[PDB]
C-alpha cells in the first residue's frame, strides 16, 4: 500500500520527507499528517517533516521553498567543498524577472537570462546529505570572470587560485560555457595564469 511505500522512503531518505516527495510517489500528503499524529515524524517547515533522526538543513529547506534558486558563487563553492569558508549568507541565481515570495534576509540574488539559468547546473549533497542544485566549478569561474568588478577582490583571488589547484577541471565545459556566455577570451586569459 502507499503507506508502506511512504514508510520505506522515509527510512531510506535519512529522516526527512516532504509534500513533494509524497506527490512524486503518488501518495496523498495527508499521510504525513497521519504520521505526525502518530509521532513518527514532526513538521519543521511548511511541507517538510523530520523523524527523530532527521536534521535541519538550511540549504535544502531554502531550495525546497524556492526551487528556481540555484546555489551560485560562494554557496556553490561551499557546497562542493571548493572553499574552506563557512558562508553566513546564501548566493543564488534565478532567471531575470523572478521575485522571491518572503525571502530570508541573509540572501544575495543574482539574475541571469533564462538561456543561462541552468547552464552548468549540477546536483550535489549538502553537509546534511540532501541533494540541492548548484553551479559546477566551470560555471562559477565564468560568473567570476564576467562579474569581477562586482566581487570582493580577496574572494576573487582566492577562488581563481582554488580552481588553479582543482585537479578535476573540465576545460571543454569551461570553454562551452564561456562561449555561450560571451566571455571566452577573458576566460582564456584567466586560465592562462592558473594552469
Author numbering: 1 to 195
Tell me what the authors wrote about this structure, in their words.
AbiE encodes a DUF1814-family toxin (AbiEii), and a COG5340-family antitoxin (AbiEi). AbiEi contains an N-terminal winged helix-turn-helix DNA-binding domain and a C-terminal antitoxin domain, connected by a short linker.
To begin, we solved a 1.83 Å structure of AbiEi by X-ray crystallography. There were four copies of AbiEi in the asymmetric unit, forming minor crystal contacts that are not predicted to be biologically relevant, and each copy contains minor variations in domain orientation, indicating some flexibility. Together with previous size exclusion chromatography data, we concluded that AbiEi is a 23 kDa monomer in solution. The N-terminal domain contains three α-helices, followed by three beta-strands forming an antiparallel sheet. The C-terminal domain begins with a single α-helix that is separated from a six-helix bundle by a row of four β-strands, which themselves pair into parallel and antiparallel β-sheets. One face of AbiEi is positively charged, and the reverse face is negatively charged. When AbiEi and Rv2827c are aligned via the N-terminal winged helix-turn-helix domain, the respective C-terminal domains differ in position relative to the N-terminal domains by ∼65°. In the AbiEi monomer, 16 identified residues were clustered at the C-terminus, forming a putative site for interaction. Overall, despite differing captured poses and discrepancy in size, AbiEi and Rv2827c are markedly similar in domain structure, fold and surface charge and are therefore structural homologs.
